[PDB]
Amino acid sequence: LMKILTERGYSFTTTAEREIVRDIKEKLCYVALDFEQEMATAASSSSLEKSYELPDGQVITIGNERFRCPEALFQPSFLGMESCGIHETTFNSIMKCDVDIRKDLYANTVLSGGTTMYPGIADRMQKEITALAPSTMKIKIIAPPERKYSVWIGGSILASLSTFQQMWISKQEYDESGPSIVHRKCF
């Protein structure tokens, strides 16, 4: 977002406007279903603008740019990104798993992490995984809007239970089996 506004000809290098665009990226964002269709609707005449006048005093919103901002993971050469595309990475990840467990593992695809900017990308992600998958495999994408605090609520579930203490390591076992065994006991 910083790069596209500064190459476009709009002044942005500053921390305060980075926080204002982070706030708008969390709240006002809306992301395309496809690469082709939303560029077609913006190409006929552009109108996808959700107008935001902030009480901070700044007026910054363009509806065309924000569905294109996370869309660059679909084709990385949009940004120039060194990292591999998402579709190919998922295909390779299923390829480097065991072949008999392949179908059962791909029947549970999960939303997680900082890519929770808007759940409009989740529909696009489900569409891309439907297009990836053949008829000889199953999909099942679980789609919670619990994707932001997901890391928190996991640990809050686990440590509450008393039967999970058998996989919680003590002082005694930490002295008997060394420091690094916390990597191995964790399961």
Partner: protein, 59 residues
Amino acid sequence: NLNAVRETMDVLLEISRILNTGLDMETLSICVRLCEQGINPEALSSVIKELRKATEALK
């Protein structure tokens, strides 16, 4: 599409009534929409009986 799956769901109610199931309308809607996504339903038949049992242990 929503008109079709509604009619098929309305037909699915009567046959879950005469087969004497533990379902009512809400767990029928959640489990039919869960089966639409597609996973092995033989394990869902065990998780449902576990969910109702684990809620019943609190009461």
